[PDB]
Ligand binder design. Structure first.
Ligand SMILES: O=c1[nH]cnc2c(-n3cc(CCN4CCC5(CCc6ccccc65)CC4)cn3)nccc12
Ligand SMILES: [Cl-]
Ligand SMILES: [Zn+2]
Ligand SMILES: [Zn+2]
Length: 340
């Protein structure tokens, strides 16, 4: 009944609302935010995670990736080529050069058309998965480095990663590892555009992708976890896959929800910080997540600790294999009770 449209919702918390992260996640779920699989949270103007970003020029990007894209007719495969380490200074120079800078554009629709028309040409460099934070030590509100969710019970899923983008750099269709939530903050720079498929329609996307990449499907059941498959919004529209789009601007947060498929691209030189987190609602998703058998650096979490603590009644039944729980993607987290 809440957000029946499953459209991306935007939230504007006051400084008071913003102070308790986990409570605010529970609040947005009470509002139906989770149904779209992606939500935007604009922080109060007074909030800043770092005073300035002018001291990061010598920050090392250990493994930049040149993103080679192959395909046609809205279906593409992205291949990553690891390049040697570069500084933020060397990266920003390449990002803003004539070769790699953002093209001239009026409306977003124009930039998006240029993205889908040129993604296979002039492969850009993505300064992705840099272990680190740009948050100052004293920042207690929405600190990606120290979120303090139930995911902390596990103790690279709890650690922050930095992503230095340039025009046309992309993230392929995927859900988070272990079908967890994620938080993404755009520290500075040019926007980041996102596409999302509601969790309730996530199996329709997987079936479509399997139909298009049968070689990839037979090799690995969870082949989208490789984060190599790019599918244009027009292909999604053509095959009746429901989706929504949103542009994230500097100083805004994006939340991805369990089993929320998302993809997107960077408009130009930017920097985003990201991590995974959990709520009590996630435990069932973690228990039922279809994982990637083959690829290296694929995250796996032992669910045992979570079932023992939050589902003790179900522990023996689940470990036995008799746990037949069916996930209702429309239900908010149990923590959302105080708002319902
Ligand atoms: O703007 C974006 N850009 C890039 N990526 C995005 C994105 N996601 C990326 C992942 C995979 C992150 N994951 C971290 C741990 C790794 C880094 C290297 C390593 C080594 C061992 C184990 C794990 C890992 C693998 C990789 C998930 N979501 N979602 C939304 C937005 C973006
Ligand atoms: Cl800069
Ligand atoms: Zn993601
Ligand atoms: Zn695999």
């Amino acid at each position: 009944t809440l957000n029946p449209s499953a459209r991306i919702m935007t939230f504007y918390p006051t400084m008071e609302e913003f102070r308790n992260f986990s409570r605010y996640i529970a609040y947005i779920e009470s509002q139906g935010a989770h149904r779209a699989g992606l939500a935007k949270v604009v922080p109060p103007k007074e909030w800043k995670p770092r005073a300035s970003y002018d001291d990061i020029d010598d920050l090392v990007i250990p493994a930049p990736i040149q993103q080679l894209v192959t395909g046609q007719s809205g279906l593409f495969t992205q291949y990553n080529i690891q390049k040697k380490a570069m500084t933020v200074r060397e990266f920003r120079k390449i990002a803003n050069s004539d070769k790699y800078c953002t093209p001239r554009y009026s409306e977003f629709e124009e930039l998006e058309r240029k993205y889908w028309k040129n993604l296979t040409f002039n492969p850009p460099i993505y300064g992705a998965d840099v272990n680190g934070t740009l948050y100052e030590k004293h920042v207690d509100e929405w600190n990606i480095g120290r979120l303090r969710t139930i995911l902390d019970l596990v103790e690279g899923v709890n650690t922050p990663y930095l992503y230095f983008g340039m025009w046309k750099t992309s993230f392929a269709w995927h859900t988070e590892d272990m079908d967890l939530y994620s938080i993404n903050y755009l520290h500075f720079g040019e926007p980041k555009s996102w596409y999302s498929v509601p969790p309730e329609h996530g199996k329709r996307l997987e079936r479509l992708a399997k139909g298009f990449f049968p070689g990839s499907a037979q090799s690995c059941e969870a082949f989208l976890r490789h984060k190599m498959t790019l599918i244009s919004p027009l292909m999604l529209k053509k095959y009746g896959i429901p989706f929504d789009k949103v542009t994230q601007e500097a100083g805004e947060f994006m939340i991805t929800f369990p089993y929320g498929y998302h993809a997107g691209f960077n408009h130009g030189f930017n920097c985003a910080e990201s991590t995974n987190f959990a709520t009590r609602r996630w435990i069932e998703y973690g228990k039922q997540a279809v994982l990637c058998s083959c690829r290296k650096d694929m995250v796996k979490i032992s669910m045992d600790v979570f079932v023992r603590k939050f589902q003790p009644e179900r522990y023996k039944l689940w470990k036995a294999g008799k746990d037949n729980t069916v996930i209702d993607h429309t239900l908010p987290t149990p923590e959302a009770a105080e708002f319902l």
